[PDB]
Amino acid sequence: SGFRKMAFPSGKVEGCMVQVTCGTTTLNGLWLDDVVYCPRHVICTSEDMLNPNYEDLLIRKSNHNFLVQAGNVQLRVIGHSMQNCVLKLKVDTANPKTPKYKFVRIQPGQTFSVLACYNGSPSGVYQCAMRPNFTIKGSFLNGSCGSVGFNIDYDCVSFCYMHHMELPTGVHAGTDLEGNFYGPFVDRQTAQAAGTDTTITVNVLAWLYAAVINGDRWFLNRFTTTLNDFNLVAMKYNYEPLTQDHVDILGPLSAQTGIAVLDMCASLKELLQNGMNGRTILGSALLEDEFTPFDVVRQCSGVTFQ
Amino acid sequence: SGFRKMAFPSGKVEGCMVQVTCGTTTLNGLWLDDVVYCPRHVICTSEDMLNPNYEDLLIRKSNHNFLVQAGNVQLRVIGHSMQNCVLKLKVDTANPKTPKYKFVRIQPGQTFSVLACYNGSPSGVYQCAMRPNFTIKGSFLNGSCGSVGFNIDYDCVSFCYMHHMELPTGVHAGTDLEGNFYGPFVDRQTAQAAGTDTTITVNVLAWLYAAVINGDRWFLNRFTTTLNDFNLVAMKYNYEPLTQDHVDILGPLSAQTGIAVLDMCASLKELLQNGMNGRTILGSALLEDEFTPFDVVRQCSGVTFQ
Ligand SMILES: COc1ccc(COC(=O)N[C@@H](CC(C)C)C(=O)N[C@H](C=O)C[C@@H]2CCNC2=O)cc1
Numbered sequence: 322s323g324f325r326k327m328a329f330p331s332g333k334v335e336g337c338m339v340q341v342t343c344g345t346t347t348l349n350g351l352w353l354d355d356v357v358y359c360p361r362h363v364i365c366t367s368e369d370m371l372n373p374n375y376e377d378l379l380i381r382k383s384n385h386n387f388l389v390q391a392g393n394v395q396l397r398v399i400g401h402s403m404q405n406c407v408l409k410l411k412v413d414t415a416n417p418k419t420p421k422y423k424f425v426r427i428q429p430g431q432t433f434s435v436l437a438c439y440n441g442s443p444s445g446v447y448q449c450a451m452r453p454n455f456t457i458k459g460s461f462l463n464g465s466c467g468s469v470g471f472n473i474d475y476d477c478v479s480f481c482y483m484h485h486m487e488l489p490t491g492v493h494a495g496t497d498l499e500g501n502f503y504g505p506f507v508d509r510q511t512a513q514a515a516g517t518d519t520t521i522t523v524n525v526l527a528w529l530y531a532a533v534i535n536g537d538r539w540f541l542n543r544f545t546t547t548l549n550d551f552n553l554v555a556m557k558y559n560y561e562p563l564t565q566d567h568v569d570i571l572g573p574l575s576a577q578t579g580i581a582v583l584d585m586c587a588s589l590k591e592l593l594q595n596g597m598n599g600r601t602i603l604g605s606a607l608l609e610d611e612f613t614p615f616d617v618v619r620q621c622s623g624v625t626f627q
Numbered sequence: 628s629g630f631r632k633m634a635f636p637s638g639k640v641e642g643c644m645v646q647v648t649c650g651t652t653t654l655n656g657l658w659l660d661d662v663v664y665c666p667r668h669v670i671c672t673s674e675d676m677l678n679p680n681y682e683d684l685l686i687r688k689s690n691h692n693f694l695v696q697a698g699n700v701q702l703r704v705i706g707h708s709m710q711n712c713v714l715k716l717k718v719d720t721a722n723p724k725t726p727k728y729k730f731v732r733i734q735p736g737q738t739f740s741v742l743a744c745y746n747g748s749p750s751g752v753y754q755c756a757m758r759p760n761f762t763i764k765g766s767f768l769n770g771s772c773g774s775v776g777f778n779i780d781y782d783c784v785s786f787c788y789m790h791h792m793e794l795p796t797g798v799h800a801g802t803d804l805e806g807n808f809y810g811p812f813v814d815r816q817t818a819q820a821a822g823t824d825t826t827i828t829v830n831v832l833a834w835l836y837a838a839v840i841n842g843d844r845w846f847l848n849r850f851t852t853t854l855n856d857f858n859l860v861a862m863k864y865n866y867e868p869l870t871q872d873h874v875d876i877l878g879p880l881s882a883q884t885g886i887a888v889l890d891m892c893a894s895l896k897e898l899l900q901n902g903m904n905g906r907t908i909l910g911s912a913l914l915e916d917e918f919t920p921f922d923v924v925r926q927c928s929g930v931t932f933q
């Protein structure tokens with residue numbers, strides 16, 4: 322029993338983090354086989370960052386302009402290239418700790434574990450979701466760039482996020498590991514802002530299922546609803562539409578608890594319309610939307626990873 | 628910017644987790660140097676667990692009754708002993724991955740990271756606090772016993788918790804790594820219950836400081852209060868007393884934000900008396916009490932560990 326915000330164990334990723342320095346700019350890199358991946362703005366200066374031309378900036382660099390440190394060992398850079406917004410540094414040494422891994426570009430609503438690092442060294446781990454507006458609500462300070470987000474599918478580390486910047490609202494933006502930003506953002510110091518966000522409906526429902534699995538039942542009711550009337554209520558409260566694909570995805574939790582998805586939707590409708598009336602669900606006084614259906618199954622059924 | 632529930636990176640602990648089997652009972656163990664530590668109820672059966680006599684049960688066992696698996700490798704047990712509620716198994720192989728480490732017994736209110744494991748394999752990591760009633764609000768299923776809680780001080784893993792059982796309210800109880808329970812609990816299947824809990828005041832204040840550091844200021848006011856009148860309010864709302872040691876501990880956050888501890892106490896008094904009036908603090912509609920002052924400093928100042 323119990324239900325907590327739970328990250329994947331981070332050891333496999335810890336073995337890959339390095340420090341990358343160029344000029345007076347230091348940030349983190351991901352060392353996999355004989356390549357180090359990092360944010361390309363490491364090659365910038367204060368003058369460049371306002372409106373940099375990265376192809377120019379990279380033409381003017383040489384392998385010796387890049388200092389890469391794995392622990393104390395210095396790694397020697399034998400080549401460099403740019404792929405979208407990530408720099409790839411070929412080094413003379415393959416990381417002996419390289420896990421089995423994949424690069425994946427995730428959809429809004431999916432969660433992942435973030436290993437926050439500074440100067441190549443891990444500071445901590447936490448869970449995040451990709452918001453519908455393609456920001457994440459992270460915890461990042463100066464020097465955090467290059468920290469990565471990941472899931473651990475079965476045996477395989479799936480990297481899905483590398484950190485690049487903080488927006489004026491205090492939320493965060495970054496790229497997949499092939500250097501493409503999530504959202505409309507760009508890697509220069511300008512006046513970009515997050516669009517208005519919405520609540521991830523399929524995840525709120527998953528978390529209500531987690532609450533039932535853990536003995537919280539006070540929000541249940543006898544009613545059901547149709548997908549259409551529910552989505553009308555959702556639109557009114559700034560919730561994402563619920564699709565039939567979402568209902569199918571929620572299948573297994575529905576089956577384990579015996580509560581049909583549309584019955585749980587009737588509960589959610591009532592919670593949106595009347596509030597909680599001073600009660601809590603899984604220790605929360607607000608509806609939580611950063612657990613996916615898979616996260617709930619994983620934690621309530623005890624899946625392990627090696 | 629940002630503030631998240633943040634666990635320590637778990638790699639150093641992942642390298643120490645093994646599986647221990649005795650009879651048909653399997654749980655997890657902690658392999659450090661040439662000793663494996665695990666809950667002694669692994670030597671029990673359904674008949675024993677109601678009121679076991681562990682000295683008897685252990686006299687009747689032999690080294691070959693204990694199967695220890697590190698990954699796939701089987702470790703050979705060359706000795707066994709009991710220390711309080713933990714079993715210590717001497718094995719023929721020193722763990723080459725043994726980190727620098729200490730065993731510490733923590734005080735109520737202190738937090739730690741839990742690496743939940745099943746069959747010797749890590750499932751996930753999360754943050755917990757030792758509640759004033761010496762339970763933790765964890766996430767644990769059958770087979771979780773032996774999972775450990777830890778902090779990473781500087782270079783050193785400080786183990787402070789090993790998991791043994793779940794109480795009827797769905798909360799959790801366990802021991803320090805020398806096998807002494809936190810709280811009045813015992814390792815047999817009987818009718819034990821958690822006492823009534825209280826809220827960890829020094830931690831709520833630390834989290835209000837985190838909110839200020841991150842731009843949440845709407846709860847501040849011009850007033851101050853005395854320790855005595857505050858503690859009167861605290862008692863009325865089931866909050867722990869605030870000591871002068873707590874005020875001193877909160878020193879650094881007071882200094883970084885310029886808000887005196889007793890001014891922040893006046894804010895907390897008003898929040899207790901009037902509620903939040905539909906607003907949130909760091910994304911929460913309730914006052915959070917599982918961040919210590921050190922946790923706030925660690926996350927808002929970017930301390931790293933190697
Ligand atoms: C210090 O306060 C702040 C400092 C800067 C900002 C907004 O500006 C940027 O975040 N620019 C990019 C760099 C550009 C070229 C993409 C950056 O600087 N990323 C950092 C990579 O290390 C991560 C930032 C650093 C601070 N918190 C973050 O997430 C907001 C607060």
Ligand SMILES: COc1ccc(COC(=O)N[C@@H](CC(C)C)C(=O)N[C@H](C=O)C[C@@H]2CCNC2=O)cc1
Nearest residue numbers: 322668767768769770771772791792793814815816
């Ligand atoms: C299955 O439901 C439940 C199964 C059992 C209970 C209460 O009983 C115990 O937790 N007894 C101790 C064993 C005794 C001898 C200390 C145990 O069984 N610990 C487990 C060590 O692996 C951890 C438990 C297992 C379930 N969740 C936990 O935290 C509650 C729910």
